[PDB]
Structures are given as C-alpha cells and as structure tokens.
C-alpha cells in the first residue's frame, strides 16, 4: 500500500482515535465537549443545546481545566491554574460562578492552592481541602466553616491522602465522602509523623543554581506506615460562632491489634456508612456497617452485622477489597467475592446474615458491578466465548438469578469485544464504549428496552485514514502449558509470511493481576515496530496474571520474581518453536513491573534473549512501597519472608547480564519506583564486569511523561531495538 | 613475535613504573619503603639501616596507612583507619609509638576520627584537629591542651579547611602553620554559616533502604562565601587550668572593604609571619609582614612592609599569588612574579623597600623556586631548547645573577627532558626525578659540587618487558597561529606511516593554565588506543594555557568557553592538513574542564568532529565553585560579567549536537563538578530532540576511580570510539 505507520505518527498523533467522553448531570441529561463549546444533550429525545458559549478561556482570562456544575444546577466551579503533584493529586485555583445570574462570586472566594473540591451530591454545598484542613461552605458566597485544625504539611492530612494511600489504597487524592443528601461529611485523616522520607534531587530550569531536595513521606517494605482515623461531621448544625464537632468512628478491634488500613468508604443510606478495613498482612479484611443514632450524635457499628473477608492462599481482592453496592433501602448489598472454585463472582449479602448467595457462577470472572436498580443488576464480565481478555455488559434479573442477559455481546460481535459503560443517574440511560478489536464504537442506550438510541462516535475518519496504511493485525490465542490455558497476543507485521523468520519483542508487564492478552485496539509504539520495521511484538499472560481465577493469580503469593518471570521465558521459547520467529533475534522489554521482569529474565541465564530494555524498573522489593509490596510478599522480617525479598533482586543476577545487551532507563524525579532502584542495578553491573547502556531522564517522573521526554525515550529505544535486531 | 599494549594491560597495570619515593629526615638522610620495611639511607655514602620492620606492627592489629617520624627521632605517628573525604581531606586514627622505648603510648591518645595531625618542625610537639578544634600536645604522653572551642561540623573550621579552601586555595585539608622553632602555632578559622549547601544523593550498598542526602557547604559563583580569621598561639605558654590566648592578626584595610581570601601563609623567621590576602575579584593581593613583640604579645604588621601584587590583564598567580622564599635572616625574599613582558620570573624583594629586582628574564617561565641557600637559589624552569613543556633544574648564584647553570639539562638529554627535584634539609643533597620522554630515571646528587652520587631507580625491568611489545611513539612539536607557537603532542601508533589515513582522537583539558603537551612518559588509555587500535591520540595547548607567558594565558580572561574551544577546533583543522589523518574520523574527549570544552566543541557546528565523550563536565559556570570560577570570570552579576556567564553554556549549544554522536558521563556522588551539570545538558538535549548516549556512575565522585568503575568507564568509552571510527 506504499505507506506504513511510522514512529513519527505515534509521537505526533497523526492517526487519531476519537473518544466520546460525557459527564452525566441528571437521570436523563449529559454534557459533551463539541469543539470548544460545552453542549448539554437530552438523552431521551435526542436534542441538544449550547451551555457554554465563551469556550475554554474567557470568564477571567484563564485557561480552564474543569467545569464542575453543582447538582441542583444553580452554580458552576471554574478550575484554573492546575499544578500536578503525584498520580491523582494536584492544586488549583477555584472561582464559583452563579448560573441563575451569570456572574462571578467575588465574596469569600476559594483560596488558590486548594488541594480538593467537591460539591455535595444534592444542592450547592462545597467542601474543599486547603493546607491539609477541611473547609465547608453552606452557600458559595458565605464564609467557610472550618472543620479541622490539625493540618500540617507532610504530617497530618485531613480530607486528602498521603503518597501511599493515593497511589496504592484509594487510587485517588480525595478523602471526603458526603452522605447522599448532603447532611454529613465523612472524612479520613492520615498521619505521617514517624514515616521516613524518600529524598531525591530536582534540578529544575537552568537558572536554579542549587538543586532542590524533594522530600516525601513514603513507607517502603517493612517501614513505619501512616495511620488512619475516620470521622463524620453534620453540616446542617454547624455553629456560626463555635467550633465544628467531628465524631470519630474507630476501626474494629480485630484491626486495632496491628497496623491496619482503611480501604473503602461507601455510604449505604443517609444514615448508614460501610467501611472496609484491611490488616497489614492483606489477607484479612473487615467491613463495618455503621448507623447513626439521633439521640446521641454518635455512630454505632454493631459487630453482628460486620462482614469478614479473608484469603487462605493469597490476598483479599485484586488490589484492594471490592466495593459493596448497596440496595436503596440500606439493608442489603451485592459484592464481588472469590468463590470456592477460585473465581470472582457477584455475591448477595443481607445486613444481619452471615455468608452470601452467589448470583453468578462458572469458569470466568466478573470485572465490576456497574449499576443497581429495583429489578436489575448490571455488570461487566469476561464470560463471552471463554476469552478472559474481552469485556461485555450483562444484566441479572433480581427476581430470577437464572435470567442473565448479555447487552453488548451481539451488537457488532466481530468489531466489538471489549466494552465499558457509563450509566446515568438512577440508570435510565447507558453509554456503551467499545474499544476493540476493531475501532472504538460509542453508543447510547435506554435501560427500559436495551434498544439503542443513537451512535455517538463511530471512528469513521480514523478508518478512512488507516486504509492508506499498511496496518498490522493482532493474533490472540492461547498455549496449553499444563492442562491450563495461558493467553497471549501478537502484533504481527503487514504482509506476514509464515515461511519467513521475523524478530520477536516481548512487551512485558507481567505483575500480579495484570493483563496483556486482550481484545483492545491500540495505536502505540508496538504498531510502529510491526508496521515499519517488521518486528512481531508479542505479549504473554502467565502465572500471576488476572481475570482468570485465583489458581492463576495467586500462584505468585510470597514469590514475586519467579513464575511471572519464568513463564515469560517459556513464552518466547514457545513462539520460537513456531517457525516464523528468528531464534537469534529475541528482545524483551517492559516498564515498571515489566522493567523488573525484563531484568530478571535477562539475568536468568536462559540463552533465549539477545537483548532487552528496562524502563523505570523495580530492582529489590525493599525499595518499593509497603502497601503494594507486602500485599504479595509479606514483611521483610526473617520470621516472615526476608529470604524471598533478598533472593528476588535484579542485583543478584548481575553476572548473567554479560550474556545479553541491556538498556537501562529511569527518570531522576521518579516519586514512585525511585531512581535508587536503577542506581543499584547499574552499580551491580559495574561491580561484576558487565557492559550495558544507560539513560537517565532528568526531572521526569514515573511515566516519563513530558512531551519532549516521551518523544526522546521512544526514539532512543527504537535505535536500541534496531541495532540489536540488525535493522538499518 | 611481539604482542601489543592492550586495554587489559592498562587496566590491570601490567607494565609498572617504579618511582623512588624518598623522604628527607635530615640534611643527609632519607627514608625509603622496601617491602613494608622502611629503611633509612645515608646520602653521600649510600648505606642503609632498617628502621621499621615489616613484621613489626602485626601485633598492632591494623594495616598502617602512613608513618610520620618526629623531627628529633624520638617518636612516630602511625596513621590507620583511613576514610577519604574530598581531594585532600580524610579522617583517621592515630597511635604514637616511642622509639627510645619500643612500645605504644597507652594514655592521652589522639582520638578516633581525627581530621589532621602535624608535628612541630623541631622537637615532638603535636597539633591535631578533631571535631573542628585544635588541640596541642607538648609531650606524646601528657594531656592535650585545647586551643579552640568554636568548632562545629559544617560551620566553623579551626585549623582545617572547608570545601572551597581545600580544593581551590590551599590544595590541602590542613590549616595549621608552626613557626620554624615550634614556639608558635598559627591557624586559620573558616566560617561557612551562610554558605549555601549543595545537596545530592548517596545510595550506598544494596542493603541501605533509603538513599542518604549528602550536604556540603559549597559557594557557587556569586553565592555567599566563607569568611576567614587568622590566629597565633604561643605554645610555650599554655595554662594547665585556663584556655590559651590566641592573638588575631587582622587583614589589611584594603581587604576588609569587601570580600576576600587568605591565600598563602609562610613563616619567615621565629618572630616573623608573612600573610598573603586576595580580594574576591582576584586581580589584587597584599602581603602583610607581621612581627611579634615580647613587649605585649601582639603581632604588628607594618604598612611600610606591605607588598602589593596586581594584575592589569588577568588574575594574580597561575592559580594563586606565589609563595615567598625568605632568606634566613628574614629581611628579604624571592617570589615568582609576572614581569613587564608577561613572563613569570624570580623577583628579589627587600622588606622595607617597595620595588623588586628581577633575577631571571626571558622567553620562558620559572615553574617553582625549590631551594634557597646562602650562595644559590635553586629553581625549576622550561628554558631549555625553547620547549614550554620540558622541565629542568637550575641554580642562580646570588652574588652574580648571570652565573646561571643548568644542573639537569645535559645529564641524559635524549632520555630526560622533564625533571623535578627534592632537596634535603639545608639543601646539601638533591634527588632528581626525570619523568620522560624515556623511562623515568631517579638519581641522587650532592649540592656542594653537583656531583652525581648514584642511580636510585632506572626502570630497567620495565624496559625489558617493553622490548616484546609494539609501543607507540610520541611527537611533540608546534603549529604557528597568528605568529605565535602553540604546542601539540601526538601519540602515534606502532609502525606508523605517512601514507595511510589514520583516525584521530583529540584528548582535551584546555583550562586556564593547563598543559597537555609535554615531554613526560605515560602508559595510559591513549597508549592502548594507539598500540592496539591504530588511533592517533592528540593533544593541543591553545590560548588560555600556561607556562608560555600571560599573553597566552590571560587571553581567556573573563571569557571562558571562547578561545580555548576555538583553538582545539583549529588544531584539528590543522591536523587534517597533515596528510596522514582521516578527516571523516576525528573525535574529541575530555574530563571535567576537558569535558566542558569537548561539549562546547561538539555543539559548535564546525563539521570537524564526528563524535566525542564528555566525562564529568562543567556545563554552566554558575554551577561550579566561586573561587575557581570568579578567578577567570568575575562575578555573575549584570554589573560585572553575567552576560558571558549565560553565553558560555553547553545548554545554549544543544541544537547543534544533532550533527555529532555524543556520550555524556558523570558520577552521581561528584562533589566537585556536580551531577547537576550533566543533568542540565541532558535536559537541554531532550527539550530539543537530539539523541545521545548516556552513562551514570552510582556513588562515584569526580575521579570515577574505584577499581570496578575505572575498568567499566574506560571499557564503555573504548566501545564508543571504536564504533564511531568503524573499527571491529
Ligand atoms: C484495570 C485496573 C483495575 C485496577 N485497580 C487498581 C489498580 C491499582 O491499585 N494500581 C496502582 C499501581 C499502578 C498497581 N501502583 C503500583 C505501581 O505503580 N507499581 C507496582 C510496581 C511497579 C509499579 C508500576 N507501574 C490498578 N487497576 N487497574
Ligand atoms: C600543574 C598544576 C599545578 C597546580 N596546583 C594547583 C592547581 C589547582 O588548585 N587547581 C584547581 C583544581 C584543584 C583543579 N580545582 C578545579 C577543578 O577541579 N576544576 C575546575 C573546573 C573543572 C574541574 C576539573 N578538572 C592546579 N595546578 N595545576
Ligand atoms: C506525641 C504524643 O502524643 N506523645 C505521647 C505523650 O503525650 C505521653 O505523655 C507519653 C507518655 O505516656 O506518650 C507519648 O506517646
Ligand atoms: C430539548 O428540548 C426540550 C424542549 O422541547 C427541552 O427539554 C429543552 O429545551 C431541550 N434540552 C436540551 C438539553 O437541549
Ligand atoms: C490567585 O488568587 C489571586 C487572589 O489573591 C488572584 O488575583 C489570581 O488570579 C490567582 N491566580 C494566580 C496565578 O495568582
Ligand atoms: C500523629 O501521630 C503521632 C505518632 O506517630 C502522634 O504523636 C501525634 O499526636 C498524631 N497527631 C494527630 C493530630 O493525630
Ligand atoms: C476552634 O478550635 C480550635 C482548636 O481546635 C481553636 O484553635 C480555634 O480558636 C477555635 N475557633 C473558634 C472560632 O472558636
Ligand atoms: C438528610 O438525611 C438526614 C439523616 O436522616 C436528615 O437529618 C436530614 O433532614 C436530610 N436532609 C435533607 C436535605 O434531605
Ligand atoms: C495470611 O497470610 C499469612 C502469610 O502467608 C498466613 O500465615 C495466615 O495464615 C493467612 N491467613 C490469615 C487469616 O491470617
Ligand atoms: C652509615 O654508615 C655509617 C658507618 O658505619 C654509620 O655510622 C651510619 O649510622 C650509617 N647510616 C645508616 C642510615 O645506616
Ligand atoms: C580507633 O578505633 C578503632 C576501632 O574502630 C580501634 O581499633 C583503635 O584502637 C582506635 N584508635 C585510637 C587512636 O583510639
Ligand atoms: C560565624 O559567622 C556567623 C555569621 O554568618 C556569626 O553569626 C558567628 O558569630 C560566626 N562564628 C564565629 C566562630 O566567628
Ligand atoms: C575557658 O576556660 C574555662 C576554664 O577557665 C572553661 O570553663 C571554658 O570551657 C573555656 N572557654 C570556652 C569558651 O569553652
Ligand atoms: C623560639 O624562638 C622564639 C622567638 O624568638 C623564642 O621565644 C623561643 O625561646 C625559641 N625556642 C626555641 C626552642 O628555640
Ligand atoms: C580587576 O578587574 C576588573 C574587572 O575586569 C577591572 O575593571 C579592574 O581594573 C581590576 N581591578 C584592580 C584593583 O586591579
């Protein structure tokens, strides 16, 4: 066809995927960003109208980052001056705008540097965090009622997470949860007094004469963790001339014996809070159901209705214990739980009753409970066809658990095998979101019929463009390594010939609960390596991987660095048993956990790999964070699992790296997997005679995310792959 | 047959130069280590006696780092437990041993972690620094007096230097100076209170979980400097119940007007100190000459005894104002001053007189004054043959300044063109120390007659070893740019011929006062590049270089990054004009200042250089230290020289590096030229799109000089020059 997908197209984004990201604002209405105008669309009858003329700029002159409308409709927040912190955390400035008047509130403004803002779910109350303390505005033009006073930089956090709870427990900076009608404000406080700092240099722009040492409370494996308290405040009874009153609700006594984590907060009703707790050995978990009591102000959590969850073989959850989806009445909930057969399935709990009824079953897993109605529960799963790498929407009839209906399986079954869903409020309308194996398809539905109303974006211009390109295909299949299936994918070059020997990259992540063999569509680096340079970029899911039952996933418990690494050698070995793969040209690469896994493969002495690349790798598990590492490994005490902590290091395999070419990459401002880890790889290689290639990225974080640095890292890695595979 | 000088032979140190490391202890005797038996030798007659046996000090329990015999012979310091700090500084443990008995001094011992130790010049007194304070010890067994109390880590340095005084002022961790007979002890005090810290990480062993942040008071260009005060204690009047009085000698009013340094301390007489100060703009210096009185104990410095040394065109000194050489009576002195013509020569000063009288002149420079008797002043110079990178010993009859006589020129004129000298006490004997261009040759001589007594070491065993190895030859010659001779050296391959086109490396330092073209013999990395791989390694001293007058040296004044860069490029243009060099295979490399000029050459755009390697380079003069930088640059203020601080960065040349292959190298614990400096080069290259090779070194300093990291850096660089020059 004359043309390929080049590296320049990946880095500059020539061939664009169009998304259809909408925010629901009611039970029937949503917002979309059509050009620079924000339109509201009525999802029943189809019609739309312009809500924001004046764009993305003009209301003060500032380029706006977000447009959060209050749920009653009367007000709007304009977010400006975004300053990224870590993965979810940021600071910004916040002007509140009156929509019934069309004018700015210059009375009692939210101060710049604000860490978090959230409207109450009803009305127009605000709660915001600023300087580690919570603030509450009853009206947006009236003074803030301050609510905590204990906040201090790097030490006490009220209403926002610390480093490790952000990245590793909640997946979020926020630690405010409102009651559904707006009355109570629940919040968690974190305490980082005795937690040790990672210290790293930051060089800044050229004019900064002395480097800044950036210092971050960060527990690594075995270290002193943070501590957690949990509170509730009533907002309707805040005194205008006295202090707020925050009633603590203490964690259950089976948690207070050790170090523990608060891992979930979901309000069941206006007067009921569900709270999951996790022991530091993350295989024992306790939910409290905590009702208010109007005669005392307090929160009682009767131990009878608390629900225990545990693991005798791994850890509770996929990363954390799963979220309960309550029924409206308060008195029951559904929750994803691993069953007796090993597989993760929906389970119905009744508030004062032990155990659960499994409402789903089989050799496959539920991914998430998406929406709960009077008569249906909607869920995504990988059930369809026996493929653990596809996603489809389902609905269980709650009066007859045998009446499950797939709502997305058959809509376009060759093009669309990987769905997600965004439901409106009360679940009246649902936007399906296909994302492979053909081009992303975005469609709107009503829940009454399951009939489709409109097609929101079909990716037509993306299609028409890509018919010029010699595009690669994806094989998706399995290999039976015992009796059990293990899944894989291959991006194969265009014009692929089974009687020709191609070079073979493994893309690797490989960590606990990962998935790399999937039906998703991607325009990435691997698309350039197959399209232009004729490399098969394959990828394997082995022992330790997710979405397939705990006999696969929990294979790696107390044993990181072993079977996820060894089955990746077996995957390359197996692909080279097939006769379209060159034996003399087999690279391996990953980022992060895959950087780690790549280095352990390179240092195993297998013979199979000529070269590899490790970007921002872990190298030794005592250098990475406590919450993640000890979830799988235990504690690095010799009463526990110190022997495997020490036996699983990249450093202790340094000797075998002279059999291989090696590129090591890392960002010097990595707040996540610190530059330490790569500094310890490189020193071990130096101390044993091996030669390798290195590349630091000055000031770049864990994602190596800057536009110039992203262009550079992939250009450098391309030249490494091409020299290794003998390509001009 | 014949083998070749390989990289393995360089690294493992196969062909070893024997030196002759003697140490004078009298006017007629020296000590020399043989087998860890230290022997004393008699100079005239040549006989020896074993003074310390190798088997003695096994019972001690430790491997000894140094021996230091007292000037009366009654004692010895045994230094052990060496722990390097910076270039000259260290911490140690010290036992004293009695040589009239044969036992250790058991009580009143020098503490552990002592920073510096020195005997008085006559006798057996001990001044030591520990915890930043001076302690005096009149007899080895008696309790130590405590001279100072103000000592404080990182802040107050009594009798030792802070960072910048160690590196750039004294070349020495020491800041004690005894009087010749031992009655007085003088000291500097540095005050680093407001000097900004520089911060960097230290990762340490694999077992260290959090990286430590090293912090060092370090004044960068323009930043607040340390201050200085100067003191003298009479150590024959220390009270056993009260503190020692320390009389402070104050600097001249013409130094106290702004910032300044104390740059030389020389005792002239038993009651006469010479002190030499330098303004922060280092083109003005004042020598005070301060006499004691027994009338009060004050030290009065007469202004009718001050001598001013200015510079009209650059800075005072080669690196600092030169050391004075007092005659015995103390009333007159000789020092190396720049004459009217710009060339450095010996000037005879008389104390009360203003002017000086030149004792030498010509088109060459005096390197050092090495001895002063009543009849002769002995000096090293480059006069011989017109060669600015040769060295020879001279003597200058003080009764007749035209009766100059070269003591070393004609000894072995083909083998020996680079000398140094060590005289005995009172200058009765001298060791000459030839360094090339043949194998090093060590000889002893008598001063009364200039008769050679013996050969001490001749490197006979190395010469036998090298007859079976194909060694490279060395050309040392000159080009003529703008009517001036500028010298170069070429290390030419074995069996070299005029007809082939050889690839050319260009080794560089290039800094102010440097000399990379000389007559000294070396077995180095360049010897392997010539021997095995057939690479001409070349070197050139352009403008800015020393030894050739101030018309060449002060060309670079205020102007670093300018003519020294231009002239390494023009030297490589010129070397291509000779027909034996491949102009598609020029490369460039240096270390430190040489990595700065490598970088400024590689980013010039000249077309000459295909590749190069900057190791631990400067990149911006505001990141390097104040004392060095501002010597040649002024202050980085817009009232001074800011504009040229900004024009002369590597970063502002980043876009042009797209034309050249590039390897940037740096060790992360470099306390001298910080890892900051390469980290801002790489940011600049990234933010502009240019690929480059990188290499870091975890915990290596400015030297990159561990056994493992020395093997690894030179192996990695060897790969880069081979693959650039297309060599297998
Ligand atoms: C699809 C899905 C669902 C889900 N639910 C939770 C998380 C989650 O908690 N993610 C945080 C995580 C990225 C694992 N933090 C650790 C981290 O960053 N690590 C670990 C070692 C290497 C390095 C990397 N990369 C991720 N998903 N994804
Ligand atoms: C021949 C000779 C004799 C001598 N006596 C003293 C000094 C001296 O004190 N020199 C300053 C020095 C120790 C090199 N510090 C500066 C330094 O290390 N720099 C400067 C920028 C790059 C980096 C390097 N390399 C130099 N000489 N030379
Ligand atoms: C910071 C803090 O709360 N420290 C408490 C202190 O108040 C108490 O007096 C002491 C002895 O009982 O115990 C500490 O843990
Ligand atoms: C849609 O049309 C009806 C009026 O017939 C009404 O709901 C509203 O004006 C329109 N809504 C939107 C979002 O455009
Ligand atoms: C911060 O708030 C101030 C009010 O103090 C406002 O004038 C300004 O626009 C805000 N943003 C910045 C970047 O200062
Ligand atoms: C934070 O925790 C430390 C113990 O790590 C304790 O001393 C301090 O009192 C706590 N502060 C608050 C506000 O809870
Ligand atoms: C509220 O209490 C805090 C102590 O937690 C105190 O510092 C503050 O003065 C009180 N505020 C008011 C308005 O009384
Ligand atoms: C919200 O529910 C609470 C809890 O019972 C009740 O106190 C309050 O009256 C309700 N408020 C609103 C606005 O509905
Ligand atoms: C949790 O894991 C540990 C470590 O493998 C094990 O000893 C313990 O029995 C497990 N189960 C519970 C409920 O603690
Ligand atoms: C050298 O020999 C003479 C004569 O025996 C002796 O007096 C002198 O001490 C000896 N010196 C040494 C260092 O052995
Ligand atoms: C210094 O301490 C070491 C122990 O590290 C000990 O062996 C030695 O005897 C001590 N030396 C002195 C002079 O106190
Ligand atoms: C050191 O200097 C600081 C000013 O930076 C001053 O406060 C202190 O007194 C001085 N200390 C000594 C021992 O001179
Ligand atoms: C000075 O000496 C007295 C004893 O006379 C002693 O107490 C004091 O420590 C010394 N001075 C200082 C500043 O330490
Ligand atoms: C050293 O010279 C000084 C100054 O003249 C005098 O006070 C002292 O007596 C002399 N000491 C010795 C040991 O010669
Ligand atoms: C020192 O250098 C400055 C800066 O170039 C120059 O203006 C001045 O004349 C010199 N000052 C002295 C005291 O020689």
Curated annotation (Swiss-Prot), chains A, B:
<dbReference type="GO" id="GO:0001662">
    <property type="term" value="P:behavioral fear response"/>
</dbReference>
<keyword id="KW-1133">Transmembrane helix</keyword>
<feature type="glycosylation site" description="N-linked (GlcNAc...) asparagine">
    <location>
        <position position="112"/>
    </location>
</feature>
<dbReference type="GO" id="GO:0046581">
    <property type="term" value="C:intercellular canaliculus"/>
</dbReference>
<dbReference type="GO" id="GO:0009986">
    <property type="term" value="C:cell surface"/>
</dbReference>
<keyword id="KW-0031">Aminopeptidase</keyword>
<dbReference type="GO" id="GO:0045121">
    <property type="term" value="C:membrane raft"/>
</dbReference>
<feature type="glycosylation site" description="N-linked (GlcNAc...) asparagine">
    <location>
        <position position="283"/>
    </location>
</feature>
<protein>
    <recommendedName>
        <fullName>Dipeptidyl peptidase 4</fullName>
        <ecNumber>3.4.14.5</ecNumber>
    </recommendedName>
</protein>
<keyword id="KW-0325">Glycoprotein</keyword>
<feature type="disulfide bond">
    <location>
        <begin position="416"/>
        <end position="434"/>
    </location>
</feature>
<dbReference type="GO" id="GO:0001618">
    <property type="term" value="F:virus receptor activity"/>
</dbReference>
<dbReference type="GO" id="GO:0070062">
    <property type="term" value="C:extracellular exosome"/>
</dbReference>
<dbReference type="GO" id="GO:0016020">
    <property type="term" value="C:membrane"/>
</dbReference>
<dbReference type="InterPro" id="IPR029058">
    <property type="entry name" value="AB_hydrolase_fold"/>
</dbReference>
<feature type="glycosylation site" description="N-linked (GlcNAc...) asparagine">
    <location>
        <position position="54"/>
    </location>
</feature>
<feature type="topological domain" description="Extracellular">
    <location>
        <begin position="1"/>
        <end position="728"/>
    </location>
</feature>
<keyword id="KW-0472">Membrane</keyword>
<dbReference type="GO" id="GO:0008239">
    <property type="term" value="F:dipeptidyl-peptidase activity"/>
</dbReference>
<dbReference type="GO" id="GO:0090024">
    <property type="term" value="P:negative regulation of neutrophil chemotaxis"/>
</dbReference>
<dbReference type="GO" id="GO:0010716">
    <property type="term" value="P:negative regulation of extracellular matrix disassembly"/>
</dbReference>
<dbReference type="GO" id="GO:0030027">
    <property type="term" value="C:lamellipodium"/>
</dbReference>
<keyword id="KW-0130">Cell adhesion</keyword>
<dbReference type="GO" id="GO:0120116">
    <property type="term" value="P:glucagon processing"/>
</dbReference>
<keyword id="KW-0945">Host-virus interaction</keyword>
<feature type="glycosylation site" description="N-linked (GlcNAc...) asparagine">
    <location>
        <position position="243"/>
    </location>
</feature>
<dbReference type="Pfam" id="PF00326">
    <property type="entry name" value="Peptidase_S9"/>
</dbReference>
<dbReference type="GO" id="GO:0036343">
    <property type="term" value="P:psychomotor behavior"/>
</dbReference>
<dbReference type="GO" id="GO:0042803">
    <property type="term" value="F:protein homodimerization activity"/>
</dbReference>
<feature type="active site" description="Charge relay system">
    <location>
        <position position="670"/>
    </location>
</feature>
<dbReference type="GO" id="GO:0033632">
    <property type="term" value="P:regulation of cell-cell adhesion mediated by integrin"/>
</dbReference>
<dbReference type="GO" id="GO:0002020">
    <property type="term" value="F:protease binding"/>
</dbReference>
<comment type="subunit">
    <text>(Microbial infection) Interacts with MERS coronavirus/MERS-CoV spike protein.</text>
</comment>
<dbReference type="GO" id="GO:0043542">
    <property type="term" value="P:endothelial cell migration"/>
</dbReference>
<dbReference type="GO" id="GO:0005886">
    <property type="term" value="C:plasma membrane"/>
</dbReference>
<dbReference type="InterPro" id="IPR050278">
    <property type="entry name" value="Serine_Prot_S9B/DPPIV"/>
</dbReference>
<dbReference type="GO" id="GO:0046813">
    <property type="term" value="P:receptor-mediated virion attachment to host cell"/>
</dbReference>
<feature type="active site" description="Charge relay system">
    <location>
        <position position="702"/>
    </location>
</feature>
<keyword id="KW-1003">Cell membrane</keyword>
<feature type="disulfide bond">
    <location>
        <begin position="290"/>
        <end position="301"/>
    </location>
</feature>
<dbReference type="GO" id="GO:0004252">
    <property type="term" value="F:serine-type endopeptidase activity"/>
</dbReference>
<dbReference type="GO" id="GO:0007155">
    <property type="term" value="P:cell adhesion"/>
</dbReference>
